[PDB]
Amino acid sequence: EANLRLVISIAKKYTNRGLQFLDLIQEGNIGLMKAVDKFEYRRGYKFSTYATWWIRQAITRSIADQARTIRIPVHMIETINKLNRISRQMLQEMGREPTPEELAERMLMPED
DNA sequence: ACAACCTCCTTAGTACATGCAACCATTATCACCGCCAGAGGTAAAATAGTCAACACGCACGGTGTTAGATATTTATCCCTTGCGGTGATAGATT
Numbered sequence: 001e002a003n004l005r006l007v008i009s010i011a012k013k014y015t016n017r018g019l020q021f022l023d024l025i026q027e028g029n030i031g032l033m034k035a036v037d038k039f040e041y042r043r044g045y046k047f048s049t050y051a052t053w054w055i056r057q058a059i060t061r062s063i064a065d066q067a068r069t070i071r072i073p074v075h076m077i078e079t080i081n082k083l084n085r086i087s088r089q090m091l092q093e094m095g096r097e098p099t100p101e102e103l104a105e106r107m108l109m110p111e112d
Numbered sequence: 113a114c115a116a117c118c119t120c121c122t123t124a125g126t127a128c129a130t131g132c133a134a135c136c137a138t139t140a141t142c143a144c145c146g147c148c149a150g151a152g153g154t155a156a157a158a159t160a161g162t163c164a165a166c167a168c169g170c171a172c173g174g175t176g177t178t179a180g181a182t183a184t185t186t187a188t189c190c191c192t193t194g195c196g197g198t199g200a201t202a203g204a205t206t
Contacts, residue, residue, distance in 0.1 A: 060141045
């Protein structure tokens with residue numbers, strides 16, 4: 001209850017058309033349960049930082065592989081999104097259309 | 113005591129029919145990297161084998177000659193033309 005607002009200010013970032021303007025807040029409100037259970041204030045650190053790690057990634061996963069058509073081990077989910085993040089160079093440095101042939105040097109790896 | 117009635121309140125339930133043409137994108141979001149699985153790698157030997165050696169041995173294809181077929185040439189024959197003589201049709205009657 002004391003943290004229900006911090007769940008909005010983190011979650012609402014990700015609700016940006018992502019799947020809906022709403023639902024990620026309520027999944028953050030369940031990530032907050034694991035956070036409240038493992039709240040090691042006995043290290044010294046603050047619940048702001050706790051939320052910035054754990055509750056943020058509960059908010060991320062709430063529509064990463066949850067609510068999709070498809071779901072995989074998570075390294076192989078967000079790696080598809082590493083490529084979309086890298087494409088921000090491609091679309092302006094090769095800079096007319098995207099080319100997997102450029103992505104091969106930007107990943108140092110074979111396409112297949 | 114209730115009853116519906118005066119007024120504009122808002123709510124929200126629908127919006128006819130047949131057909132053809134077009135192509136299928138946008139998001140970001142640390143997945144972290146730690147562990148170890150059976151599990152990737154590969155050495156040495158099972159399930160068994162390569163292809164080079166020297167033999168083996170054969171088929172196929174091209175060069176040569178032969179064969180006979182075919183398309184020409186020739187000339188014959190028939191079926192056809194066009195006109196003509198005169199046909200019994202068309203059909204009205206018996």
